[PDB]
Amino acid sequence: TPSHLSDRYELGEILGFGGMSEVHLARDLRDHRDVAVKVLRADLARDPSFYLRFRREAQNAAALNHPAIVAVYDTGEAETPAGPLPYIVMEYVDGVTLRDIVHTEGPMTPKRAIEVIADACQALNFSHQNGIIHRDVKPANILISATNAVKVVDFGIARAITAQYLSPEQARGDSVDARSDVYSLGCVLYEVLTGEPPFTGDSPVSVAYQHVREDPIPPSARHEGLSADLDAVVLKALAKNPENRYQTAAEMRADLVRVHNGEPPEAPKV
Amino acid sequence: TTPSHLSDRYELGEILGFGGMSEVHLARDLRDHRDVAVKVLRADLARDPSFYLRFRREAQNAAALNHPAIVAVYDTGEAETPAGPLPYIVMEYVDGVTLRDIVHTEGPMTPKRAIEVIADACQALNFSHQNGIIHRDVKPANILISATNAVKVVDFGIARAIADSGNSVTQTIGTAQYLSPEQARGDSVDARSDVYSLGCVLYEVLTGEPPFTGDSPVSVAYQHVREDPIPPSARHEGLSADLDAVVLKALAKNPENRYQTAAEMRADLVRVHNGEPPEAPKV
């Protein structure tokens, strides 16, 4: 990868690695600001199967406009003498992932967890009202900024009509919809609350199997300082049948809000 | 695209097989003047910390077992070139093929051969268990047959911590064909699991298919949990009711009903091999 893309974006340190792409902190020398640039790993920039796969993801990136969603600024294709190198330029978030927080700091307090997840529900809801399912909600895809704001990254591109955060339907290979993001957000909620996701296993298959077939253990049975109410919410978000989950991320956030307040939630009492 | 050399001692050659994070190379040991197998982190995953860490742990904690039917571990290290550090493990080399390639190119074995092979796998797993090591991933791709027909087992899981429960602590889209029920549920895995998995392999070398197949790993995992396996002799000819009894005991849903040890399973495979009645329920 070159030091500069398009004589505009000056690549700096790696923020994170993804499937085929890596995200860099960079200076937009033209707009004079720091940005995040997602590029295709240089080695992979010759396999056409990858160049094409990435360019569609870039061309068709979810460009949503919401405080809790990392914006998309620009998309491009640079010119290293070796070859054309495709990239997406995005909002930069000076912060750390939920995955890092949970790992270095452990489970959050119920109050903090609720604030974080309800804020994620807003990003998800705004995304949903705009026709877009994230499909990969998970702690590594939720960012917390230095000033403590939630920023969600890595929305999947629109479609036609590991495994710790899959919904039963993705696991079965059935069709997914907004409710599917709901289930996954609940997995994250479960983890920030208890230090662990609902299901663990020796292999993605095992975990997938559990999502589809095993009853989750109520969070309070795995960590202290969790109320029965809060249990009911998490458990509803984790319902096996989409028909029985929260129907929208809004519904989910409203029940989270009630628990923050200390009011009984609309969720069932197990 | 890895380097040509490691630690100025091992020069790498053809790839023998690829795994999760890692590729296995046939290499020449320039100090000891011999061919070894070298399992290294894939070069493209090397900048990535979560893969480097995951592998460093695997390399340092590799299971060194000393047994004819187990591929030895010679050295464990970290090479530092401008792509590394690249933890790696140096192992006994087996000039041979996987039990998986065999079944795929040659078809099912004869009971006489199947039994001999699985019986040797049993001696490997028994030895390992008696050394506190559970394999956890027994499957055709992890059993090699040497050019002289010796059985050699690879890819033992690293030792893990056991909880207050007396259960094993869990570690870490796939095969799902050799999964035990306890693995599927994410329960405690132990010697009985290896026994069950080896059962699946035995079933596969005898009949040409593992006990359960399906169009999703999830759905196969389910069959392991809930569904009865059809006796081998109903799927392939030339197999006796006694052989069925042994395979089906190994494949039992409740670990308390399987062979409790690999040596026990080996004992019933030897009896069948000899024309004796097995200790296992008629069916």
mmCIF file of N, CA and C in Angstrom, chain A residues 1 14 17-19 22 41-44 99 103 162-164 166 171-172 196 200-210 212-214, chain B residues 44-45 47-50 54 136 160 169-176 179 182-187 189 216-219 221-222 225-226:
data_model
loop_
_atom_site.group_PDB
_atom_site.id
_atom_site.type_symbol
_atom_site.label_atom_id
_atom_site.label_comp_id
_atom_site.label_asym_id
_atom_site.label_seq_id
_atom_site.Cartn_x
_atom_site.Cartn_y
_atom_site.Cartn_z
ATOM 1 N N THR A 1 0.859 -1.225 0.000
ATOM 2 C CA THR A 1 0.000 0.000 0.000
ATOM 3 C C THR A 1 0.882 1.258 0.000
ATOM 4 N N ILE A 14 -2.809 1.569 11.477
ATOM 5 C CA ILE A 14 -3.970 0.706 11.272
ATOM 6 C C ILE A 14 -4.938 0.807 12.444
ATOM 7 N N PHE A 17 -8.252 -4.672 11.525
ATOM 8 C CA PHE A 17 -8.241 -5.549 10.365
ATOM 9 C C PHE A 17 -9.620 -6.138 10.178
ATOM 10 N N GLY A 18 -10.019 -6.340 8.929
ATOM 11 C CA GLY A 18 -11.310 -6.952 8.621
ATOM 12 C C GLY A 18 -11.052 -8.153 7.735
ATOM 13 N N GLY A 19 -12.102 -8.696 7.119
ATOM 14 C CA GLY A 19 -11.946 -9.816 6.188
ATOM 15 C C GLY A 19 -10.842 -9.571 5.168
ATOM 16 N N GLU A 22 -8.329 -3.540 5.386
ATOM 17 C CA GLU A 22 -7.804 -2.995 6.613
ATOM 18 C C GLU A 22 -8.113 -1.504 6.668
ATOM 19 N N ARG A 41 -6.524 -5.189 1.339
ATOM 20 C CA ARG A 41 -5.152 -5.633 1.604
ATOM 21 C C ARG A 41 -4.332 -5.699 0.304
ATOM 22 N N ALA A 42 -3.152 -5.086 0.306
ATOM 23 C CA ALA A 42 -2.349 -4.964 -0.926
ATOM 24 C C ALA A 42 -2.114 -6.281 -1.669
ATOM 25 N N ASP A 43 -1.939 -7.365 -0.924
ATOM 26 C CA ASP A 43 -1.687 -8.657 -1.545
ATOM 27 C C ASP A 43 -2.928 -9.104 -2.302
ATOM 28 N N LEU A 44 -4.096 -8.803 -1.734
ATOM 29 C CA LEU A 44 -5.364 -9.240 -2.312
ATOM 30 C C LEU A 44 -5.794 -8.367 -3.495
ATOM 31 N N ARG A 99 -15.440 -4.392 21.923
ATOM 32 C CA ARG A 99 -14.683 -5.613 22.143
ATOM 33 C C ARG A 99 -13.483 -5.342 23.042
ATOM 34 N N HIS A 103 -12.895 -6.505 27.025
ATOM 35 C CA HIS A 103 -11.746 -7.382 27.247
ATOM 36 C C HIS A 103 -10.744 -6.785 28.223
ATOM 37 N N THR A 162 -16.482 -15.891 16.108
ATOM 38 C CA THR A 162 -17.422 -16.102 14.995
ATOM 39 C C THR A 162 -18.678 -16.832 15.471
ATOM 40 N N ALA A 163 -19.827 -16.430 14.935
ATOM 41 C CA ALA A 163 -21.083 -17.080 15.266
ATOM 42 C C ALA A 163 -21.583 -16.743 16.645
ATOM 43 N N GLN A 164 -20.859 -15.916 17.387
ATOM 44 C CA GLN A 164 -21.338 -15.573 18.715
ATOM 45 C C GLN A 164 -22.500 -14.606 18.677
ATOM 46 N N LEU A 166 -24.513 -14.307 15.586
ATOM 47 C CA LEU A 166 -25.495 -14.701 14.581
ATOM 48 C C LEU A 166 -26.843 -14.871 15.214
ATOM 49 N N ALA A 171 -28.033 -18.491 11.193
ATOM 50 C CA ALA A 171 -27.498 -19.814 11.468
ATOM 51 C C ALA A 171 -28.188 -20.896 10.628
ATOM 52 N N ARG A 172 -29.515 -20.861 10.556
ATOM 53 C CA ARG A 172 -30.239 -21.809 9.725
ATOM 54 C C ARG A 172 -29.982 -21.546 8.251
ATOM 55 N N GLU A 196 -19.620 -12.150 28.913
ATOM 56 C CA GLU A 196 -19.590 -13.233 27.948
ATOM 57 C C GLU A 196 -20.852 -13.228 27.121
ATOM 58 N N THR A 200 -21.283 -20.096 24.127
ATOM 59 C CA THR A 200 -19.864 -20.280 23.892
ATOM 60 C C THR A 200 -19.667 -21.741 23.533
ATOM 61 N N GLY A 201 -18.579 -22.056 22.849
ATOM 62 C CA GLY A 201 -18.401 -23.410 22.354
ATOM 63 C C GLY A 201 -17.034 -23.537 21.734
ATOM 64 N N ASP A 202 -16.661 -24.758 21.366
ATOM 65 C CA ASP A 202 -15.327 -25.039 20.843
ATOM 66 C C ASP A 202 -15.154 -24.726 19.368
ATOM 67 N N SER A 203 -16.217 -24.240 18.740
ATOM 68 C CA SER A 203 -16.232 -24.072 17.288
ATOM 69 C C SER A 203 -17.415 -23.220 16.880
ATOM 70 N N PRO A 204 -17.281 -22.514 15.758
ATOM 71 C CA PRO A 204 -18.425 -21.740 15.329
ATOM 72 C C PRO A 204 -19.679 -22.631 15.185
ATOM 73 N N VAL A 205 -19.523 -23.862 14.695
ATOM 74 C CA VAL A 205 -20.685 -24.739 14.517
ATOM 75 C C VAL A 205 -21.433 -24.936 15.817
ATOM 76 N N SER A 206 -20.696 -25.299 16.861
ATOM 77 C CA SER A 206 -21.292 -25.510 18.171
ATOM 78 C C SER A 206 -22.112 -24.313 18.568
ATOM 79 N N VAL A 207 -21.544 -23.133 18.389
ATOM 80 C CA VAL A 207 -22.198 -21.918 18.848
ATOM 81 C C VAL A 207 -23.431 -21.724 18.009
ATOM 82 N N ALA A 208 -23.272 -21.795 16.685
ATOM 83 C CA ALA A 208 -24.407 -21.693 15.774
ATOM 84 C C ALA A 208 -25.494 -22.665 16.209
ATOM 85 N N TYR A 209 -25.117 -23.902 16.495
ATOM 86 C CA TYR A 209 -26.127 -24.857 16.887
ATOM 87 C C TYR A 209 -26.883 -24.355 18.122
ATOM 88 N N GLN A 210 -26.169 -23.736 19.042
ATOM 89 C CA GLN A 210 -26.836 -23.342 20.266
ATOM 90 C C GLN A 210 -27.800 -22.198 19.992
ATOM 91 N N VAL A 212 -29.548 -21.661 17.508
ATOM 92 C CA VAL A 212 -30.740 -22.223 16.933
ATOM 93 C C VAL A 212 -31.513 -23.140 17.865
ATOM 94 N N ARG A 213 -30.866 -23.736 18.858
ATOM 95 C CA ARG A 213 -31.505 -24.859 19.549
ATOM 96 C C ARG A 213 -31.527 -24.792 21.078
ATOM 97 N N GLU A 214 -30.575 -24.101 21.691
ATOM 98 C CA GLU A 214 -30.515 -24.086 23.150
ATOM 99 C C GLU A 214 -31.104 -22.806 23.744
ATOM 100 N N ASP B 44 -0.314 -13.899 5.435
ATOM 101 C CA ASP B 44 -1.246 -12.790 5.266
ATOM 102 C C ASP B 44 -1.982 -12.442 6.565
ATOM 103 N N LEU B 45 -1.991 -13.359 7.524
ATOM 104 C CA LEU B 45 -2.612 -13.093 8.815
ATOM 105 C C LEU B 45 -1.605 -12.600 9.846
ATOM 106 N N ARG B 47 0.410 -9.786 10.253
ATOM 107 C CA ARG B 47 0.373 -8.430 10.805
ATOM 108 C C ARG B 47 -0.737 -8.343 11.847
ATOM 109 N N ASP B 48 -1.761 -9.160 11.659
ATOM 110 C CA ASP B 48 -2.945 -9.137 12.509
ATOM 111 C C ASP B 48 -2.688 -9.770 13.874
ATOM 112 N N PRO B 49 -2.689 -8.938 14.933
ATOM 113 C CA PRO B 49 -2.381 -9.312 16.318
ATOM 114 C C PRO B 49 -3.219 -10.477 16.879
ATOM 115 N N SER B 50 -4.535 -10.458 16.661
ATOM 116 C CA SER B 50 -5.410 -11.487 17.227
ATOM 117 C C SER B 50 -5.152 -12.870 16.645
ATOM 118 N N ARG B 54 -3.212 -15.652 19.008
ATOM 119 C CA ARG B 54 -3.923 -16.931 19.028
ATOM 120 C C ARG B 54 -2.970 -18.074 18.691
ATOM 121 N N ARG B 136 -9.896 -33.640 20.877
ATOM 122 C CA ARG B 136 -10.964 -32.646 20.644
ATOM 123 C C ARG B 136 -11.324 -32.381 19.174
ATOM 124 N N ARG B 160 -6.229 -27.524 28.349
ATOM 125 C CA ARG B 160 -7.010 -26.431 28.910
ATOM 126 C C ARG B 160 -7.295 -26.627 30.383
ATOM 127 N N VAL B 169 -12.808 -26.232 30.572
ATOM 128 C CA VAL B 169 -13.087 -24.852 30.224
ATOM 129 C C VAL B 169 -13.014 -24.691 28.706
ATOM 130 N N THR B 170 -14.065 -24.132 28.116
ATOM 131 C CA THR B 170 -14.174 -24.030 26.656
ATOM 132 C C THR B 170 -13.131 -23.093 26.088
ATOM 133 N N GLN B 171 -12.733 -23.316 24.831
ATOM 134 C CA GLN B 171 -11.667 -22.515 24.191
ATOM 135 C C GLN B 171 -12.079 -21.835 22.871
ATOM 136 N N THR B 172 -11.299 -20.829 22.469
ATOM 137 C CA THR B 172 -11.513 -20.076 21.219
ATOM 138 C C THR B 172 -12.573 -18.994 21.375
ATOM 139 N N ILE B 173 -20.165 -23.292 8.586
ATOM 140 C CA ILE B 173 -18.905 -22.619 8.898
ATOM 141 C C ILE B 173 -17.804 -23.606 9.347
ATOM 142 N N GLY B 174 -18.081 -24.908 9.202
ATOM 143 C CA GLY B 174 -17.150 -25.982 9.597
ATOM 144 C C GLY B 174 -17.639 -27.383 9.213
ATOM 145 N N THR B 175 -16.881 -28.421 9.597
ATOM 146 C CA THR B 175 -17.209 -29.825 9.269
ATOM 147 C C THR B 175 -18.532 -30.319 9.892
ATOM 148 N N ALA B 176 -18.632 -30.228 11.221
ATOM 149 C CA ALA B 176 -19.812 -30.713 11.952
ATOM 150 C C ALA B 176 -20.111 -32.183 11.769
ATOM 151 N N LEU B 179 -18.447 -33.990 15.162
ATOM 152 C CA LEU B 179 -18.869 -33.425 16.444
ATOM 153 C C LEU B 179 -19.609 -34.381 17.368
ATOM 154 N N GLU B 182 -21.849 -33.447 23.089
ATOM 155 C CA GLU B 182 -21.445 -32.502 24.121
ATOM 156 C C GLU B 182 -20.749 -31.289 23.506
ATOM 157 N N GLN B 183 -20.018 -31.511 22.417
ATOM 158 C CA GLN B 183 -19.421 -30.395 21.719
ATOM 159 C C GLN B 183 -20.485 -29.498 21.110
ATOM 160 N N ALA B 184 -21.470 -30.120 20.474
ATOM 161 C CA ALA B 184 -22.545 -29.370 19.854
ATOM 162 C C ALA B 184 -23.194 -28.429 20.862
ATOM 163 N N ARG B 185 -23.531 -28.951 22.036
ATOM 164 C CA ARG B 185 -24.162 -28.147 23.077
ATOM 165 C C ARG B 185 -23.184 -27.205 23.774
ATOM 166 N N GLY B 186 -21.890 -27.391 23.516
ATOM 167 C CA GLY B 186 -20.863 -26.600 24.179
ATOM 168 C C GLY B 186 -20.723 -27.024 25.618
ATOM 169 N N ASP B 187 -20.923 -28.314 25.872
ATOM 170 C CA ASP B 187 -20.728 -28.861 27.211
ATOM 171 C C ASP B 187 -19.289 -29.310 27.366
ATOM 172 N N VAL B 189 -16.115 -31.345 27.288
ATOM 173 C CA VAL B 189 -15.573 -32.360 26.372
ATOM 174 C C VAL B 189 -14.389 -33.103 26.983
ATOM 175 N N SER B 216 -26.545 -28.240 6.016
ATOM 176 C CA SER B 216 -26.022 -27.227 6.908
ATOM 177 C C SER B 216 -25.284 -27.909 8.042
ATOM 178 N N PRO B 217 -24.193 -27.304 8.482
ATOM 179 C CA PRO B 217 -23.546 -27.881 9.633
ATOM 180 C C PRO B 217 -24.486 -27.890 10.847
ATOM 181 N N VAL B 218 -25.237 -26.814 11.030
ATOM 182 C CA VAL B 218 -26.203 -26.747 12.126
ATOM 183 C C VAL B 218 -27.153 -27.954 12.193
ATOM 184 N N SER B 219 -27.673 -28.352 11.042
ATOM 185 C CA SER B 219 -28.636 -29.429 10.958
ATOM 186 C C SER B 219 -27.950 -30.776 11.224
ATOM 187 N N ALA B 221 -25.300 -30.971 13.217
ATOM 188 C CA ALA B 221 -25.019 -30.917 14.643
ATOM 189 C C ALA B 221 -26.224 -31.445 15.394
ATOM 190 N N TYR B 222 -27.396 -31.066 14.916
ATOM 191 C CA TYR B 222 -28.654 -31.491 15.514
ATOM 192 C C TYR B 222 -28.826 -33.015 15.462
ATOM 193 N N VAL B 225 -26.979 -34.651 18.122
ATOM 194 C CA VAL B 225 -27.639 -34.514 19.403
ATOM 195 C C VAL B 225 -28.852 -35.433 19.515
ATOM 196 N N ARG B 226 -29.762 -35.372 18.544
ATOM 197 C CA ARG B 226 -31.091 -35.957 18.738
ATOM 198 C C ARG B 226 -31.346 -37.289 18.009
#
